[model samples]
Target: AEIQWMRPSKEVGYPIINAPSKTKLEPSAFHYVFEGVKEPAVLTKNDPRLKTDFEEAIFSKYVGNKITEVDEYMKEAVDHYAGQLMSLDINTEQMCLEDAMYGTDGLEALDLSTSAGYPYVAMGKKKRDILNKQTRDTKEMQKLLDTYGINLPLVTYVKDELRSKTKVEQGKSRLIEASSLNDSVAMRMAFGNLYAAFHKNPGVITGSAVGCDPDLFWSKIPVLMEEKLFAFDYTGYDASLSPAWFEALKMVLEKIGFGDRVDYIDYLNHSHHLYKNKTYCVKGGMPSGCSGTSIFNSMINNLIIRTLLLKTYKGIDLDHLKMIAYGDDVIASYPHEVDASLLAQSGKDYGLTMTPADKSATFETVTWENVTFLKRFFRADEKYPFLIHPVMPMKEIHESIRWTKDPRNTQDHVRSLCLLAWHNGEEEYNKFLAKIRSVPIGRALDLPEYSTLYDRWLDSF
Candidate 1:
């Protein structure tokens, strides 16, 4: 009898975004129908739960740091080193691409079956099933690639450009790229894991950006570098793309050494169109799905750290400063205590938001004062335990125990414990083994499974 109007909605992304208003429905006398003509008015705002002050500072820094181009020396240094750092031994371009694709075949690990085994549940069962099928079906994958043109131009379906305004924990919404599976694979093959070079050196310890062993990194300091440390963090690091990144992308291109690369630029830019507030909008960041995002961030950080140390402390020996940066997280051995303002300016010059506030600290030695970096705490006055063995946070130990006991998780139960033990220490590992033995299911199979998997893990790396 009465017309019902639906509330305005925004389009959603993987981690959950709003639905688009044009897609909203209305109920008429005849039947429920589409409200295609009307586009609802929408404005972006931080969720009230978010820390508005911190968010505002991030926003201000992002806008204020805008630049027409990156500094010549910064670009030169970044490009020069980037070329040297991530170089693969492959001889031909086609062979290199194939090799990279093979390396990233591990993306299958992110698919439904393997991913369902992960600790966090992010998607619905049906959605997970669909994604799983799409990735697993070799024929379907090949057909999908054919539609985008096999062995031809990479950027296709450019006209149907679709991106998303995704919700984030700290901010209202992030404008991020939404690419097809083919592009994702391509992006990985093109730019991924530039930090692998660091791992080649025994001195430069490495792991997943978050998984990188900070304890091992700390241990390296005592043996390889000075004990003095100063750690600073990248503000709004991930998914916070500023206006300056377009220039940064160009620099990334030059460093990547792709000659006659105008089309790749088109692929990076034109193919990445954000759909927000019922219209397409432009944003500079690469897709989170792209392997390039991590590589690009890591490269930027690597450059910033090297240049900052060289420029800030006059005549400071670059050799004395030992640094390891995984993506945006950096912990470095500073020669001595320098003014924070100097770091701020040096950071700002590169259009980077480097600050001491976020889990960062300066200390003479880990034994003297406790400091936390990369979400891992190093205890004060505990030199031998830190240098000789690793320890995890107590809460992590508790949670891993919970996860290990849960029936819903099968392989991950054992896998996670093995991972924890590998990082945490022999004592924790033994304790975890005892816990596993205590459980009925674990007693039957988990320990046996773990022994095999543990050996495999040990050998694989």
Candidate 2:
């Protein structure tokens, strides 16, 4: 027997991200074991039929423009915020690790003994002298300074280093220390720096204006306003100002052609109603509805599936797929000879019903099997109706895929998943177990029988 090889297109990049071009199989000598089939064969891309099916699947299910918009918005937001923080240089030390282990308990207790539990151990006496000499009027300011906790030596060292530098330079150093946009801690530090800078140079401050306030001189600068406003209400600081900053930000944003993008985000948030009680039930507990994990999962399951199918199936050569705009209703072209039969079989196998069709919009040479198959799959009898013909272009299929992958659609999918899980007798744990069992490879794993354990767990819940 001759050995044949199948390879995917180089343009598609890595197979990890892209589906393989073909399914390969070797004919076994024991082909006679199967009663009707003569060959124990593997499918390959060389078989146009296989390619067509795969293409159709990809086209129909691929992520669409709506999804792309959401993805792009998220990326833009992340990049903008990340860039602002990247502008600063600061030492984190082991604070993250310490917080993970003991939370704020250790730091809070240490705060009582020293200038709040900041790592002041390295700071030495000179730094302390400078701090003592410095005016501390507001409780807020005092609290900010008090963060030195048990690490007095470190704080002293930093203070001494600051003393050696000139006032402007020292202020700059403090600003650098205070200006972190990445996290709440960093944002607090940044806020502290601004506060300190204001106290240090009251004239430079001009007014006690909010960062985003259009009236503020700094608000005019788009980048600066973005950095400050990006924290919004998420961070502990009062970055969420009213009318003035909002107007200024909007102006700057519009000037930069970011108006639509911002509006789109606002529309998305408005559409999703994220402002009020953004809570959703999850496996661990009630997590925020805006949780990144939930969003990602939704995109993957609902939107991405459609996008992937469309892109792979409906290339330049094929007719496109169309959507009827009534939720999931869609239409597409399918190969007359093979796809029609496959669609018919798939419908029957998957419990879908279709009506017979003799003709379609495509060339006379084209067949109506594909049309009939799609009509049956989408269910023409349903409230949301769709029609597929042999003549539909590939571009339409691409667009259809894009729509399915939209972020809203994906999020809805996740919401549905959650709802179904909640309504089902089984909780997330049981659902997880079911998912694991459903995996072809996972079935082979020697999973412990948890029938009794599950009952106990449910009782406790």
Candidate 3:
């Protein structure tokens, strides 16, 4: 019989990436199988889809402009307040990680859930550091800040780190992170109707903020904020901030008196092993958590930003894809795909200042522009999303042949992949499981029963 090489024939592959591209088959099989040797040859190109590190750094500057006003404020805030901040007193060593459940003991510092709730995901010392309702020492953190000539309040703000995740840079493959944004942990989840402030109606505002991407979520927000959103929808964003943004973010940290000794140097892995080298550079995003402050910074900044950059699109399909981000009722779903003049003009009403090229705006873009937008924001299709990567890291996320024998746990595993998240437990897990299963490889988490001990594992967690 002839050997029909389904996948490079018997020529399977094995690889050891600092991070695996997938966990199961094909590309992953090429990377993981025992019979495999070297990983497949990756094609390098002027692939417009892929971004070079240098290209990304420059792009970060473009992002800086969106929040330019905030950046301006932050710069001034730092310049004037640096001296005072240096003299501020952190004074204590411990603090209860303030819970922000809006009520319901997820953590007594705030309020969330049952014992197995709030910090229900990870246990041990790390959990204590993150969710325990106890005092944390400030001496070590204090000393670290002192070296920077800044005195911080006894606050828990991890400096944030930079790591590779995924993005659209490669056909919808990537973005960027930092734990530092987690510093303002309190108002992290309280984004109110004011930002979405407008009559609750159906309208497409283009939802474009001129520079919403790297401005707020990428820089001001820590990983935790998205973790919350991703928990609801599983569509996680990157958690990195650049050194340039870090410079601006420090002012906010100092103003809030937020500083911790940990994670000072930041991180990066280059064809090598990982190690944290100490430097006062503060190289990540705002922190890993936040709610209001960061939002206001981004919101007001974006509001001002849009008002400034509110020009029609000048890029490809310029005339056909033209759209702007101003006016109260321009409420947007995704953006650029609609015309509002045809929209109801007033309560069932809407209007426009300019002519849009296309008229395909989603009604939900305008209607769900309010509190209900959370549902739209959390949905997994245009609804729930995923991290698409360049050169792709699979970690077997797609090839679930193994999970086919036992799908439930793998379903849970998919949910676990998101970091710093306040996991929604089985209730949300089942929700995500259902969503994942609907995807082609998602059923790999189907075919079988969960381990008898699996439910207990969930309980134990």
Candidate 3 residues lying further than 4 Å off, grouped into runs, are 1-294, 301-461
- Residue range 203-276, candidate 3, lDDT tens digits: 11222222232111221122212111101111111122233233443343434344432122122100011111
Report, for every candidate in turn, its global Cα lDDT versus the true structure: 0.42, 0.23, 0.26
**lDDT, residue 5, candidate 2:** 22
lDDT of 2 by residue, 1-461 (tens): 00012233232221111112232223222122212221111122243223234222311211111111233322333333223322332222223322321223212111112222122221222223322223322333334445532111101101111111232221211100111011223222322332222222211111112111111221122221111110000110111111222223333234333343333222112111110112111111101121121221221112212232333334422212211111112222222222333333323321122222333332232222232211221112122122111122222222222222233344343333332222122343355345434545335444433354334323432
Displacement of residue 403 (Cα, Å) in model 3 is 11
Ranking by TM-score: 1, 3, 2
RMSD of each: 12.3, 26.7, 17.5
Q: Which ten contiguous residues of candidate 2 have the minimum total lDDT?
A: 228-237
Residue 56, model 3, lDDT: 34
Residue 159 of model 3 has an lDDT of 20
Could you tell me the C-alpha RMSD of candidate 1 in Å? Answer: 12.3
Which regions of candidate 2 fall more than 4 Å away from where they truly are?
Answer: 1-44, 47-53, 60-293, 296-451
